[PDB]
Amino acid sequence: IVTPYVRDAGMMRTYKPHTPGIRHLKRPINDHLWKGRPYLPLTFPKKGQSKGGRNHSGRVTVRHRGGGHKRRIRMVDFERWIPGPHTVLRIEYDPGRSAHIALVKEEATGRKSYIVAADGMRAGDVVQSYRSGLPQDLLDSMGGVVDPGILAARTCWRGNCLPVSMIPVGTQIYCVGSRPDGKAVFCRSAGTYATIISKEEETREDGTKVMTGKFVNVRLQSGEIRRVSKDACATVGIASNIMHHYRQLGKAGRSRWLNIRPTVRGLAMNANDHPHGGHPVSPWGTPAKGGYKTRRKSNVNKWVVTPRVRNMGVRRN
Amino acid sequence: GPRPTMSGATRLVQKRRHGFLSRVKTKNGQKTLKRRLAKGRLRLSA
Amino acid sequence: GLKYRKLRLTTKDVNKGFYKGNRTGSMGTHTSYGTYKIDYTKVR
RNA sequence: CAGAAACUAUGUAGGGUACGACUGUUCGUCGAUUAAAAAGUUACAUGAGCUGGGUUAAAUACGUCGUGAGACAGUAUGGUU
RNA sequence: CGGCCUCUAAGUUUAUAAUCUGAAGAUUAUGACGAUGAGAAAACUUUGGUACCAACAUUUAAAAGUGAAAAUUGUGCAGGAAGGAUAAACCGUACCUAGAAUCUGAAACAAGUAAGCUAGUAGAGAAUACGAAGGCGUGAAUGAGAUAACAAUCAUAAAGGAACUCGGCAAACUAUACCGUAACUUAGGGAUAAGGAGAGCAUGGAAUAUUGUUGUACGACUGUUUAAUUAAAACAAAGCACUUUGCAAAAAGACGAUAAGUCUAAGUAUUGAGUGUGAUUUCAUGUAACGAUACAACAGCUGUCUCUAUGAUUGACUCAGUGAAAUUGGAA
RNA sequence: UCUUACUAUAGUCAGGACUAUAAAGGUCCGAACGGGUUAUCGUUGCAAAGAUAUCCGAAGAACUAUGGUAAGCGAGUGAA
Ligand SMILES: [K+]
Ligand SMILES: [K+]
Ligand SMILES: [K+]
Ligand SMILES: [K+]
Ligand SMILES: [K+]
Ligand SMILES: [Mg+2]
Ligand SMILES: [Mg+2]
Ligand SMILES: [Mg+2]
Ligand SMILES: [Mg+2]
Ligand SMILES: [Mg+2]
Ligand SMILES: [Mg+2]
Ligand SMILES: [Mg+2]
Ligand SMILES: [Mg+2]
Ligand SMILES: [Mg+2]
Ligand SMILES: [Mg+2]
Ligand SMILES: [Mg+2]
Ligand SMILES: [Mg+2]
Ligand SMILES: [Mg+2]
Ligand SMILES: [Mg+2]
Ligand SMILES: [Mg+2]
Ligand SMILES: [Mg+2]
Ligand SMILES: [Mg+2]
Ligand SMILES: [Mg+2]
Ligand SMILES: [Mg+2]
Ligand SMILES: [Mg+2]
Ligand SMILES: [Mg+2]
Ligand SMILES: [Mg+2]
Ligand SMILES: [Mg+2]
Ligand SMILES: [Mg+2]
Ligand SMILES: [Mg+2]
Ligand SMILES: [Mg+2]
Ligand SMILES: [Mg+2]
Ligand SMILES: [Mg+2]
Ligand SMILES: [Mg+2]
Ligand SMILES: [Mg+2]
Ligand SMILES: [Mg+2]
Ligand SMILES: [Mg+2]
Ligand SMILES: [Mg+2]
Ligand SMILES: [Mg+2]
Ligand SMILES: [Mg+2]
Ligand SMILES: [Mg+2]
Ligand SMILES: [Mg+2]
Ligand SMILES: [Mg+2]
Ligand SMILES: [Mg+2]
Ligand SMILES: [Mg+2]
Ligand SMILES: [Mg+2]
């Protein structure tokens, strides 16, 4: 009996600690990922000095960036206006996204596009976006424009993109949008999801609800319950790479492949270029601890129902 | 002390930095030309 | 490099794509694959 | 002052007064030999003769003092003679 | 057989349009321009794994081997350009490649500089040794003598073996497909542990080839750092912790005589930024591993020393040639 | 045209050993290459940073080439 080189426990992969730089390397297990190259006409190269943290002036505006692996951007559809059934061809890995993407194919025309894959989605699954309205067959089967019960059963499936209004309360969505005709902005990262708290509805006394407001309340991944539009899009599911945050890089060289450069502490500097060298503050004088809020005061959140719960520096565990 | 800062120097970088077209075509390079021209310089650039 | 660097650059000094003619006149046009088509209306 | 050894003092500087351990150093301390293992002056006698144990730095950590920049006859490692 | 020429990347733009702006100018889009890249044929010629041409590995011009080229297949994650297409003009061609007259270092400088090839023997090898061709053994910018002291670079050494010294500084020792291998341990290691061994004085030169072992302090580790006196205990580091960021037109942060605007990001709370800590274990501290770090012990080793001697070369010295410098109030 | 960071396009790393792989490792010994640990010499030097030996890394956070961007009221770049 000999232990294998690859040691699989949980959903995280570990290796034999035959080097000090591979002992603490932990990877999530995703074997279903497409082992080939992405759909080229849906990608473009990410190069230039912006990869090095430089803006149009040429000066460093984002620190600790540059020197990473060559990459390409994946054009991912966060609007999903086109209707009809789409067949998932393969779940792929995107360097620039924590979550996984799915190369869907429109059965009507055959055009392919990328979408943030849900947790559990595999090839062959048929997804559909009801953001552009309901088709005639589905609309005709019920016999009414909106029935709060039958509609959810036929359309509230994992990977389906619907307006938040059509989704029942308590459903987990992962591509929550903000504007009535805007792309998904919230909960797009791996493992993130949002529950639907309530809807501005009224009772007809027949047991059928009907929309009366213009918004809906949803709890975001940060715990903030905020007012979202009624026509805001939302995909039913959770982002594919749930265990992303359980990974470990193991060595300093893997952070350099991810386009991350060394972070020099303020204490390790001289007093000429940091307040600390020679209360916690950034190199430019922004308090780094003490609860100071960097949101602009004159910018009030008119969509906040229940704000985030501040931890106030207390330790969690 | 002085360093060998011109070892491996190419004459293509000499024309792109201190050439005549690098100066007539810029607001700050037209001053250098006129100054060297008003002084009597034969070698206005490169 | 002290002094020769300051002389006027010629084609017999550098090779990295530096071209300079002798005012021999244009006798044709350049093709897209690097050849030359002699226009005998310009030939004298 | 019986002898021997030792004590005190008077002449006398010819030649000697070594070796090692531990102590940053001379201060010193000890080991075992030895007739004995005494001192001082000479710009520390002597670095245009050597060393760098020193004579001064910039690095780093710790300690103490100061609101702070810093300071210290502090401590440790390193540092073109 | 390169350039010119066509195409474009990073980028540039006193090009045009719009927009912002005390002037200068700046921003965005388009155009133009821009190789270090891509460009039909020729021993005669004119869609996206049904993929792609990053790294690595494998296979393939059929007598065998080797090295390319291109392609085939596959592996790992760190997920790997753009665009165009597809009857012979003009310019380069000499010499020099740094140990012998040419590049950069103020110069005829013991330094530095890109690519291909670079006999053979012997090897695992581009190691080490010899050297076929070739070049060289400097432009008197030197040559011939002599072989003191002393210096530099070396060789050997009786007995002793660190007694030297701030300190083992320097030098010396250290030596094949074998049987057997401990505490400890993050279970990978420790480990090539250790311990047993491979005709004449010698199966013989060179290189491989270096003090070894053990235990402490500090830092987990590989790395980075004051170009040219400090390479480390310092910086970074993976991991961990905290604060902040909901993106509805500006997410926060950074930048903008100052804005439009740009990076963040074609990202979205498992995102981004900032801050401290510095793997793991126990919650500052204890181990495995690692160190041109600092220190101690033990064994060996030796000219470090008792205590120096001798030998070698190059200077020093003499003759011929060439010919400096700091310095100097005046000097019996 | 030095140098620091980034950027685009390219190149380079004999041989052997171990490890789960034919290829998965900031693995091991060691040339090229890159460093500059210790000592000696040199100090009007061969050299305004060199010579000799010794030592370190050598598939990577590696090294190298040709261009590009960012510097001087503010501070560019900075594993500091
Ligand atoms: K950061
Ligand atoms: K840090
Ligand atoms: K300091
Ligand atoms: K202006
Ligand atoms: K090595
Ligand atoms: Mg960090
Ligand atoms: Mg400092
Ligand atoms: Mg300088
Ligand atoms: Mg250069
Ligand atoms: Mg020439
Ligand atoms: Mg030339
Ligand atoms: Mg050209
Ligand atoms: Mg008596
Ligand atoms: Mg006498
Ligand atoms: Mg004395
Ligand atoms: Mg004297
Ligand atoms: Mg200091
Ligand atoms: Mg302190
Ligand atoms: Mg040292
Ligand atoms: Mg030609
Ligand atoms: Mg062009
Ligand atoms: Mg070219
Ligand atoms: Mg030379
Ligand atoms: Mg040479
Ligand atoms: Mg020269
Ligand atoms: Mg020659
Ligand atoms: Mg001769
Ligand atoms: Mg002897
Ligand atoms: Mg003997
Ligand atoms: Mg002694
Ligand atoms: Mg002693
Ligand atoms: Mg030694
Ligand atoms: Mg360390
Ligand atoms: Mg230094
Ligand atoms: Mg040094
Ligand atoms: Mg910890
Ligand atoms: Mg903003
Ligand atoms: Mg710390
Ligand atoms: Mg610590
Ligand atoms: Mg190291
Ligand atoms: Mg003479
Ligand atoms: Mg440069
Ligand atoms: Mg290695
Ligand atoms: Mg090593
Ligand atoms: Mg260095
Ligand atoms: Mg001297």
UniProtKB/Swiss-Prot annotation, chain A:
It comes from the Eukaryota. InterPro entries: NA-bd_OB-fold, Rib_uL2_dom2, Ribosomal_uL2, Ribosomal_uL2_bac/org-type, Ribosomal_uL2_C, Ribosomal_uL2_dom3, Ribosomal_uL2_RNA-bd_dom, Translation_prot_SH3-like_sf. Gene3D superfamilies: 2.30.30.30, Nucleic acid-binding proteins (2.40.50.140), Ribosomal protein L2, domain 3 (4.10.950.10). The keyword Nucleotidyltransferase does not apply. It is found in: Mitochondrion. GO terms for cellular component: mitochondrial large ribosomal subunit. Its main location: mitochondrion. Coiled coil: none annotated. Residues 53-69 have a biased composition (Basic residues). GO terms for biological process: mitochondrial translation. GO terms for molecular function: RNA binding; structural constituent of ribosome; transferase activity. Residues 44-69, 269-295 are annotated as: Disordered. Belongs to the universal ribosomal protein uL2 family. Component of the mitochondrial large ribosomal subunit (mt-LSU). Mature N.crassa 74S mitochondrial ribosomes consist of a small (37S) and a large (54S) subunit. The 37S small subunit contains a 16S ribosomal RNA (16S mt-rRNA) and 32 different proteins. The 54S large subunit contains a 23S rRNA (23S mt-rRNA) and 42 different proteins. Component of the mitochondrial ribosome (mitoribosome), a dedicated translation machinery responsible for the synthesis of mitochondrial genome-encoded proteins, including at least some of the essential transmembrane subunits of the mitochondrial respiratory chain. The mitoribosomes are attached to the mitochondrial inner membrane and translation products are cotranslationally integrated into the membrane. This is Large ribosomal subunit protein uL2m. It comes from Neurospora crassa (strain ATCC 24698 / 74-OR23-1A / CBS 708.71 / DSM 1257 / FGSC 987).
Curated annotation (Swiss-Prot), chain B:
It is found in: Mitochondrion. It comes from Neurospora crassa (strain ATCC 24698 / 74-OR23-1A / CBS 708.71 / DSM 1257 / FGSC 987). Component of the mitochondrial ribosome (mitoribosome), a dedicated translation machinery responsible for the synthesis of mitochondrial genome-encoded proteins, including at least some of the essential transmembrane subunits of the mitochondrial respiratory chain. The mitoribosomes are attached to the mitochondrial inner membrane and translation products are cotranslationally integrated into the membrane. Component of the mitochondrial large ribosomal subunit (mt-LSU). Mature N.crassa 74S mitochondrial ribosomes consist of a small (37S) and a large (54S) subunit. The 37S small subunit contains a 16S ribosomal RNA (16S mt-rRNA) and 32 different proteins. The 54S large subunit contains a 23S rRNA (23S mt-rRNA) and 42 different proteins. This is Large ribosomal subunit protein bL34m. Belongs to the bacterial ribosomal protein bL34 family.
UniProtKB/Swiss-Prot annotation, chain C:
Coiled coil: none annotated. It comes from the Eukaryota. It is found in: Mitochondrion. Belongs to the mitochondrion-specific ribosomal protein mL41 family. Component of the mitochondrial large ribosomal subunit (mt-LSU). Mature N.crassa 74S mitochondrial ribosomes consist of a small (37S) and a large (54S) subunit. The 37S small subunit contains a 16S ribosomal RNA (16S mt-rRNA) and 32 different proteins. The 54S large subunit contains a 23S rRNA (23S mt-rRNA) and 42 different proteins. Component of the mitochondrial ribosome (mitoribosome), a dedicated translation machinery responsible for the synthesis of mitochondrial genome-encoded proteins, including at least some of the essential transmembrane subunits of the mitochondrial respiratory chain. The mitoribosomes are attached to the mitochondrial inner membrane and translation products are cotranslationally integrated into the membrane. This is Large ribosomal subunit protein mL41. It comes from Neurospora crassa (strain ATCC 24698 / 74-OR23-1A / CBS 708.71 / DSM 1257 / FGSC 987). The lineage of its organism: Eukaryota, Fungi, Dikarya, Ascomycota, Pezizomycotina. The chain holds residues 9 to 52 of 103 of the full protein.
